[PDB]
Nucleic acid binder design. Structure first.
Lengths: 76, 76
DNA sequence: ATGTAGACTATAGTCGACA
DNA sequence: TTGTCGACTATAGTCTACA
C-alpha cells in the first residue's frame, strides 16, 4: 500500500510512546475507538484528516512538530 | 470545521493554480473524481491520506515540499 | 497493553447531467 | 471551468468480545 500512510503511522507510534501513553488512552483523548488506532499503528489503515486532527490533539502535539518529524522521517 | 482541513485544501488549490492545472487536469493525474477535488477545495470535505498522497502525485509535488508549504500556511 | 475478527454504521469517493 | 445535486460503491471508524 501507501508509502506515506505507513510513515505517518510510524510517526504516530513514536510520539505516542515518547509521551508514554497506552492505545486506549489516546483513543479516549482522540475520541476515536481504540481498535481503529491499533489498525493504524500496526497495519497502516487509511485515516482521514479529521481523524489525524484528533490524534494530533490526542498526543497534545503541534500540527507542526508532527509534520516536521514526518519530514525527517520521509527523508528515508 | 477542521482547521487542519481548510489549511490542507488551500495548499492544494495554491499548488494547482501555480502549476496552472485545471481541476479536471488534477482529477486525471490523481486518478480521482472532479466533483471530489471540487468538494475538498471548495467546501472542506474530508479526504484521507491515500487521497492526499495521490494528490501530491497529481500535483507532481514531493511530499516533503507539500508539508513544508503546508506548515508555513498554518503559521499565518 | 495489544491484535484481530466480524457485524455494523457513517461518510469517503464514483459517476453522469446541467447551471 | 468549475460547483452542485442525486444516486450510486467503497471503505473508514465503531463496537463486542477473547486470546
Amino acid at each position: 500500500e501507501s508509502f506515506l500512510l505507513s510513515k505517518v503511522s510510524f510517526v504516530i507510534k513514536k510520539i505516542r510512546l515518547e509521551k508514554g501513553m497506552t492505545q486506549e488512552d489516546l483513543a479516549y483523548k482522540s475520541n476515536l475507538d481504540r481498535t481503529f488506532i491499533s489498525g493504524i499503528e500496526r497495519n497502516s489503515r487509511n485515516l482521514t484528516i479529521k481523524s489525524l486532527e484528533l490524534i494530533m490533539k490526542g498526543l497534545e502535539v503541534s500540527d507542526v512538530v508532527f509534520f516536521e518529524m514526518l519530514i525527517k522521517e520521509i527523508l528515508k
